[PDB]
Design a protein around this ligand. Structure first.
Ligand SMILES: *CC(=O)N1CCN(c2ccccc2[N+](=O)[O-])CC1
Ligand SMILES: *CC(=O)N1CCN(c2ccccc2[N+](=O)[O-])CC1
Lengths: 304, 304
């Protein structure tokens, strides 16, 4: 029993983290096979960062200007290319610690683990969600760029995120491992505002199911509702609209607990309209939205 | 910027986790050098767990009855001894993945990472605190026993916790790596109630300093207080008394922020007396007590 914000074990990713230096800029790269992936802004002076022409900046750079260090051993760079907002550094050695991996571009509301890194060294691991506005609420200082977000399926690491930016409002923006930003963000030091950060409704409901399973039940009520009625309440409180897809995904949690998705929605509706009245749920005073239904099943069943 | 409940990278510990089977009981062991450490209740039938005589049960067990599996390779057990509530299984092979390590018995209020494991396989990592009542608020299912709590200092893993029990109230009890329980708990399926779970006052204050650093400042007030005045409020709200030791430890956070410890105490006092009025602090609706001052410095400076 008990329910915790849980990150994947970080070992398989720790073995991929390297340091990339170009001129005087240092940040993190990801070494998979004979390719090191890093944010392309590794080529920028912070002057460059106001309005960088990456194509023009990168003409000035050769293979030998990319200093790649894995632990205390230097990697020989034999090629470099720009793919969207990342550089791919071809090195002469395949990472012997390359796990099975995929690159996946996640949907908003999906959760992943971040291994926060500085000079290609891990400092810590935490669990995140891709917010509906395609920001993540991270913990990142200068040098953290190139830290990666991931999921693990038994032995296969699915990389979904590379860290690039902090927005002036202290939330985080970044790319898939093809170098495409989540959201409308660019790798430029410019006015970039986040949209409305909506609550991930299906995740809150999964979390309410997690609570019931763990004995926290005070918020179960006598009521039910409809998808249309619930969605009017959701709109008013900046919750994502709930779909029959969301209902379907919550099915096994519904089946395990014997509480109908729409009953649980009616519990959520009352919590939204009445607040928690100073009570807590799984030791939280607000409604948690960074567990997926998959996350709740996994933690509540003990998948390794 | 941003502030997250962050676990140590788990790689160095993942490489130590094994499966221990005795008769039909399976749980996790920790393989360091040529010794596998596991909970001694690995020798129990769940019948045994009502009132086990471990000395008497262990007479019935030989080296070959302890099945130790690391990945899919079996370890040869050449010796077994009971130290307090753990077994030490001497194997014929030193773990090649043994990191630098110590065994440390932590104080209540100190934080550590747990690598939750099942059949010697990692499922996830989260950050915990040793509560003042020597419980931890974990996430553990059947098979999770032998999962370990740790801190990492650059390259040295300090093991502080091995998982043994869930109390009837769904909190967790366990031992240092010498097999001594934290708190008054025994490895027996009996009436065991936790004492008063008090809030770790110095950790809340460290967390308030973390908030200020990250721009969350609304709770800073015009007031100050004294250690004696603050402690009267702390007593009333089941907060640990604050000592000059606690003040000293908060010094660098005080020095970095320019907010006197006793001013911050006066902010905490008002939060205790008035509550949060529906506001949040670092995205929490309650006062977080599972970051140490060391945790706040580390995350806010980017120590690897
Ligand atoms: C996020 C991170 O670690 N990061 C981005 C900012 N950065 C940088 C970019 C261009 C020029 C200089 C610098 N810098 O100040 O180091 C460092 C890496
Ligand atoms: C915590 C854990 O994984 N654990 C403790 C309970 N347990 C056990 C002990 C004695 C006899 C049987 C069993 N069992 O049901 O497996 C399993 C291991």
């Amino acid at each position: 029993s008990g329910f915790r914000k849980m990150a994947f074990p970080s070992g398989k990713v720790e073995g991929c983290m390297v340091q990339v230096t170009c001129g005087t800029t240092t940040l993190n790269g990801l070494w998979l096979d004979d390719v090191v992936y890093c944010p392309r802004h590794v080529i920028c002076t912070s002057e460059d960062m106001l309005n960088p022409n990456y194509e023009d900046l990168l003409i000035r750079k050769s293979n030998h200007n990319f200093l790649v260090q894995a632990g205390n051993v230097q990697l020989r760079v034999i090629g470099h290319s720009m793919q969207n907002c990342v550089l791919k550094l071809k090195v002469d050695t395949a990472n012997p610690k390359t796990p099975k991996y995929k690159f996946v571009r996640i949907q908003p509301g999906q959760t992943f683990s971040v291994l926060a890194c500085y000079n290609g060294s891990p400092s810590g691991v935490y669990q995140c969600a891709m917010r509906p506005n395609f920001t993540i609420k991270g913990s990142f200082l200068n040098g953290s760029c190139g830290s990666v977000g991931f999921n693990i399926d038994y032995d296969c690491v699915s990389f979904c995120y590379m860290h690039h930016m902090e927005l002036p409002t202290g939330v985080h923006a970044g790319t898939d491992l093809e170098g495409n930003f989540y959201g409308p963000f660019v790798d430029r030091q410019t006015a970039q505002a986040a949209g409305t950060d909506t609550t991930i409704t299906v995740n809150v409901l999964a979390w309410l199911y997690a609570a019931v399973i763990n004995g926290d039940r005070w918020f179960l009520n006598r009521f039910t509702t409809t998808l249309n009625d619930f969605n009017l309440v959701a709109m008013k409180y900046n919750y994502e609209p709930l779909t029959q897809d969301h209902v379907d995904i919550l099915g096994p949690l519904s089946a395990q607990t014997g509480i109908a998705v729409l009953d649980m929605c009616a519990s959520l509706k009352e919590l939204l309209q009445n607040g928690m009245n100073g009570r807590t749920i799984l030791g939280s005073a607000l409604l948690e939205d960074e567990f997926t239904p998959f996350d709740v099943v996994r933690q509540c069943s003990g998948v390794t």
